[PDB]
């Protein structure tokens, strides 16, 4: 617990202690009022006056405690802002320091390099997959004759009612831009 | 040496933040003060109410002065390129720079950063210019601002007119000083 | 004590640095995403998405 | 609350877009991991049959 | 989401095609494993009967 | 010409300028920064002026 | 520079590069005046 969190804890506690003191005074104004009535009915006017002075005293104590509690709450509410905004400021300071370190060790030029290398190394893995698959294809050529695959596709297309002939080797902006390159 | 442009830029922004906040706070406290004048007038304590409104007039003038300085700090930020570029003081900035140097010793109790703004402007345009500003020998400090931060007592007719308006607003009977209303 | 060790000029500095360092992280995200986009261009042809 | 609603609306799109980009990269390293396992197994078969 | 849908459409075909190729290779090493077991058993029979 | 004005905001612009000066020589770099070379874009120089 | 750095960390405004009683001054002026 921080030195300021201790002070906030004590201010919150004092505010509640004053609020309880106001509640105790109010409940004792009610208790003393009951005793005035009893003393009047018994004709004990001296004792009635002692209770009357207690009732009016605890009525006024209650307002003073209530008012002080309100003031100590207002102060406790402000030190809460100071405690929380301190925690936020230290966390931001820490983030700034951490990111300053990582932006040094991996600056944008180094990121640029790493991303270029990443892309170029997956181009190479595409070249490698292609030639593994071309090898496997030639390896098992006799297990998949071309004409048998073509005929199975045509049969399944006929069943589906699809008009596309499957034996055959089955954008204009690109074509026009090509014609421009030839024309110049 | 001495002058650092970023010390000046940072502190000009800080001065605006602090003034902007003090104007709000002082405006609110003037509301609470005017209610107190009505309470004194209701209690028939007019001769005290007169002395209490002198405090209100001075705070109201101060809030108006803070608005003028806020404007000159914002002007030096807007034309900060010129400050940093030239070695001579431009005409467009002369009012602002001289007034800020003049005001700092009056205001630096409330607005601590205003001292640093003044000290940097003196480092830029030389200590001698700084001395000619503080006395207004330089004949360039804003007249309305100097009036609003004067130490003189308010005119008696202003005090009476303040009481008339406050009394009217809070529906309190008030009869103004016949001698003052005649002298006007 | 804390207003000495972290005065407003120092806060001003820290906040400027904070903002400027997140500008840089935006520049870095952008070029990671541009790389990944070009990396998998053949998996998402423009006309198919349209 | 209006400024929070509009802020979290826009954060959601940035996270969604970044998630899509990191998936696209994860999908590519999956190919690299699997095709590596296949290449080592083929290398091993070639050596055994030799 | 449209770019994700079209991306995962195309990833699916690449994985399906690679799976077909690795099956074709797995089917061939099955022949090599089984025909090796048969050849060793025949070698053993020949030696026993000799 | 622009790099010394902008390099507070755009830090990489300094490196671009430094490389272009390394390529076409320091003297050309100095003639640029003052626009003695008479080739710097006029609209840009207006837009980055310090005048009110 | 080390003093300035440590002063910046402490929030102390005193510039450390620079070369950082009135009764004595007045009594001196008296000696000059006679």
How far is CA B82 from each of CA B4, F48, F52, rounded to the nearest angstrom? 15, 12, 8
B11 contacts chain C (CB < 8 A): yes
Count of CB atoms situated within 10 Å of the CB of B103: 26
CB of E34 within 8 Å of a chain C CB? The answer is no
Structure tokens at B20: 């902007």
Cα separation, B97 vs B141, in Å, equals 8
> For residues G13 and G33, what is the distance between their CA atoms, to the nearest angstrom?
39
Long-range contacts of B162-170 (CB under 8 A, 24+ apart): B162/B53, B162/B56, B162/B57, B163/B37, B163/B41, B163/B46, B163/B49, B163/B50, B163/B53, B166/B34, B166/B37, B166/B38, B166/B41, B166/B53, B167/B38, B167/B41, B169/B34, B169/B38, B170/B34, B170/B35, B170/B38, B170/B41, B170/B42
Determined by cryo-EM
Resolution reading in Å: 3.0
Q: Give residue for tokens 């840089």.
A: C24
Residue C20's Cα: distance from chain center in Å?
9
Contact A122, C41 (CB under 8 A): no
Query: Which structure tokens are listed for D3?
Result: 């400024």
Distance CA A149, CA A183 (A): 43
Using CA atoms in the order A170, A176, A179, A184, what is the torsion angle rounded to 10 degrees?
-160
Joined together, the tokens standing for residue A125 give 């893995």
State the Cα–Cα distance between residues B125 and B101, nearest whole angstrom: 11
Q: Looking at chain E, which residue has its C-alpha nearest residue A132?
A: E21
Q: Are E14 and D30 in contact (CB under 8 A)?
A: no
Whole-number Cα distances in Å, C24 to C20, C21, G7: 7, 5, 30
Compute CA B34 distance to the chain's CA centroid, rounded to the nearest angstrom. 20
- Chain C residue with CA closest to E9: the answer is C43
A133, E19 Cβ separation under 8 angstroms? no
Contact G9 C4 (CB under 8 A): no
Q: Does C29 touch chain D (CB under 8 A)?
A: yes
- What is the token pair recorded at B149? 């931060």
C-alpha distances in Å from residue A70, one per residue of A11, A67, A109: 12, 5, 59
Quick check: B98 and B140 in contact, CB under 8 A? Answer: yes
On chain D, the residues whose CB falls within 8 A of the CB of E31 are none
Rounded to the nearest 10 degrees, how much is the dihedral formed by the CA atoms of F11, F14, F17, F22? -130
- Breaks in chain B, after residue numbers (C to N greater than 2.5 Å): none
CB contact under 8 A, D24 and C32: no
Preferred mutation among E4, E7, E11, E12 to probe C, highest tally of C CBs within 10 A: E7
Does the CA dihedral A12-A13-A16-A17 come out positive or negative? negative
CA nearest C39: which of E7, E16, D39? E7
- Residues of chain C with C-beta less than 8 angstroms from the C-beta of E3: 44, 49
Neighbours of B98 (CB within 10 A): 25
Q: C31 is written with which tokens?
A: 């070029």
Within 8 A of D38 by CB-CB distance, chain E residues are: 22, 25
Say how far apart CA B124 and CA B114 lie, in whole Å. 15
Q: Exposure pattern of B40-54 as b/e (b: 16+ CB <10 Å)?
A: bbeeeebeebbebbe
* Residues in D touching E35 (Cβ below 8 Å): none
| A118 to C18: CB separation less than 8 angstroms, yes or no | no
Among chain C residues, the shortest Cα distance to G13 is held by C4
Compute the C-alpha angle G11/G16/G18, nearest 5°: 140
* CB of C30 less than 8 A from some CB of D: no
Secondary structure of residue F1 in the 3-state scheme: coil
Identify which of C6, C15, C24 has the shortest CB distance to residue A103: C24
Q: Do D24 and C40 touch (CB under 8 A)?
A: yes
B157: Cβ contacts below 8 Å, ≥ 6 apart: B180, B181, B183, B184
Q: After which residues is chain G broken (C to N over 2.5 A)?
A: 20
Q: What is the dihedral of CA B108, B111, B114, B115, to 10 degrees?
A: 40
Q: Which DSSP symbol is given to A145? A: -
Residue B65's closest CA among B32, B35, B110, B31? B110
Q: Helices B113-125 and B127-134 sit at what angle, rounded to 10 degrees?
A: 120
């Amino acid at each position: 617990m921080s030195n300021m969190e201790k002070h906030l804890f004590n201010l919150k506690f004092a505010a509640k202690e004053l609020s309880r003191s106001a509640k105790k005074c109010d409940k004792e104004e009610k208790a003393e009022k009951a005793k005035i009535k009893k003393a009047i009915q018994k004709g004990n006017m001296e004792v009635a006056r002692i209770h009357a002075e207690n009732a009016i005293r605890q009525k006024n104590q209650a307002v003073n405690f209530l008012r002080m509690s309100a003031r100590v709450d207002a102060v406790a509410a402000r030190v809460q802002t100071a405690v929380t905004m301190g925690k936020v400021t230290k966390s931001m300071a820490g983030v700034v320091k951490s990111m300053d370190a990582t932006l040094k060790t991996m600056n944008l030029e180094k990121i640029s390099a790493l991303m270029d290398k990443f892309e170029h190394q997956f181009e190479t893995l595409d070249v490698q997959t292609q030639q593994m698959e071309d090898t496997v294809s030639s390896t098992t050529t006799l297990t998949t004759p071309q004409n048998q695959v073509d005929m199975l596709l045509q049969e399944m297309a006929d069943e589906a009612g699809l008009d596309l002939n499957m034996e055959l080797p089955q954008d204009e902006l690109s074509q026009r831009l090509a014609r421009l390159r030839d024309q110049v | 040496s001495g002058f650092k442009a970023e010390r000046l830029r940072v502190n000009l922004r800080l001065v605006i933040n602090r003034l902007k906040l003090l104007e709000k706070k002082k405006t609110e406290l003037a509301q609470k003060a005017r209610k107190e004048i009505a309470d004194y007038l209701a209690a028939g304590k007019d001769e005290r109410a007169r002395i209490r409104v002198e405090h209100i007039i001075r705070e109201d003038y101060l809030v108006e002065a803070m608005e003028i300085l806020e404007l000159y700090c914002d002007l030096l930020l807007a034309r900060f390129g010129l400050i940093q570029s030239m070695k001579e003081l431009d005409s467009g900035l002369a009012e602002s720079v001289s007034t800020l140097i003049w005001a700092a010793p009056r205001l630096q109790s409330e607005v601590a950063e205003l001292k640093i703004v003044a000290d940097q402007l003196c480092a830029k345009y030389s200590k001698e210019y700084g001395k000619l500003c503080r006395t207004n020998q330089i004949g360039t400090v804003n007249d309305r601002l100097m009036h609003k931060l004067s130490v003189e007592a308010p005119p008696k007719i202003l005090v009476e007119r303040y009481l008339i308006e406050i009394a009217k607003n809070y529906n309190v009977p008030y009869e103004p000083d016949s001698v003052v209303m005649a002298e006007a």
